[PDB]
Amino acid sequence: KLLLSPAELLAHWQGHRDLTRRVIEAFPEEGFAAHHAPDMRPFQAMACELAGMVEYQLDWFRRGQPTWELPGRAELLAWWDKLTAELGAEVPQVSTEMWATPATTPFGKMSPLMSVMYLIDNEVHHRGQGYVYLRELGVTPPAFY
Amino acid sequence: KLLLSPAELLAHWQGHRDLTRRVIEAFPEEGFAAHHAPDMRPFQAMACELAGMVEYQLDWFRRGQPTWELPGRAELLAWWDKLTAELGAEVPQVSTEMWATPATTPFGKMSPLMSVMYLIDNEVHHRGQGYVYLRELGVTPPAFY
Ligand SMILES: [Zn+2]
Ligand SMILES: [Zn+2]
Ligand SMILES: [Zn+2]
Ligand SMILES: [Zn+2]
Ligand SMILES: [Zn+2]
Ligand SMILES: [Zn+2]
Ligand SMILES: [Zn+2]
Ligand SMILES: [Zn+2]
């Protein structure tokens, strides 16, 4: 504890999620579910993975302990907005002591802070992959910065 | 100030940089400098951008204020290792009060903390793009987690 506030972390997270939402919106419906690189999934599956991870983290914050068809563009965007509202309503209620308790996962110990940082990194990772997909589908991605 | 220590931030940063180093190592020499998606650069240019950003941040930490041919794989890796050593030797010396002073940039105000978080996000972004490039060159990327 010395650098970052929970509110600043949540705002950073929500900005990332808004940019990912605009990436999802920029995809054509067909390439969203079909286009992929060799031995890689289409962005539909990646975005479903990200939304499921947000569900996992929300469930962690709600219960106090983590528990260890693919949607089209429109359904996924509605799911994304629901997750956005729930993150904005529930994460501020997270006790800032809870953020640091290394709860036990099959891998090892992990705080909610470390898990949220990993979720953010995974989102940025797959969103850059989606940037490449958008370029290969003839679409200018939303500006990264 | 409530969540993250400078040492934890630096360790996170260095793990990210090690993974990017392994991505650079996994590239074939030709595709490293030549392969790219439409309206995108090859990974050579992206990695040069990342290394230049690390130079910018090191210069910020050294002077107290930010100042606002492409290398092949081997030269870039040597540059990367030099930057790694300098980050590991100089960032621990950063006054944790300095981390939060919003120094002035042409865009606006920005702490070293916000700038480092942006640098990390940009690295993860372009590294995911490099993951796609590696798959398109017939190479299994190093595991993300
Ligand atoms: Zn296919
Ligand atoms: Zn395609
Ligand atoms: Zn990370
Ligand atoms: Zn993934
Ligand atoms: Zn070309
Ligand atoms: Zn090529
Ligand atoms: Zn960011
Ligand atoms: Zn860039």
CA trace torsion B115, A15, A86, A3 (10° rounding):
10
User: Rounded to an integer, what distance in angstroms lies between the CA atom of residue B45 and that of residue B100?
Assistant: 31
Query: Do A24 and A48 contact (CB within 8 A), yes or no?
Result: no
Name the phi and psi angles at A134, rounded to 5: -60, -45
Of A6, A12, A136, the CB nearest to B2: A6
State this model's resolution in angstroms.
2.1
Q: Is B104 helix (H, G, I), strand (E, B) or coil?
A: strand
Cβ contacts of A67 within 8 Å, gap of 6 or more: A56, A59, A60
Interchain contact, A3 vs B9, CB within 8 Å: yes
- Domain positions in chain A: 1-145
- End-to-end Cα separation, chain B, in angstroms: 27
Number of inter-chain CB pairs under 8 A, A vs B? 102
Interchain contact, A39 vs B135, CB within 8 Å: yes
User: Rounded to an integer, what distance in angstroms lies between the CA atom of residue B52 and that of residue B27?
Assistant: 20
Helix intervals (H) in B29-111: 29-34, 43-63, 73-90
Q: Is B107 helix (H, G, I), strand (E, B) or coil?
A: coil
Cβ contacts of B56 within 8 Å, gap of 6 or more: B66, B67
Measured between CA atoms, the residue of chain A closest to residue B111 is: A3
Q: Is B64 helix (H, G, I), strand (E, B) or coil?
A: coil
CA proximity to B122, closest of B4, B3, B20, B5 = B20
Binding positions of B for Zn(2+): 12, 16, 35-36, 49, 121, 126
- Extended strands (E) in chain A: 103-104, 109-110
- Smallest CA–CA distance, residue A7 to chain B, in Å, is 10
C-beta atoms surrounding A63 within 10 Å: 9
Query: Do B42 and B34 contact (CB within 8 A), yes or no?
Result: yes
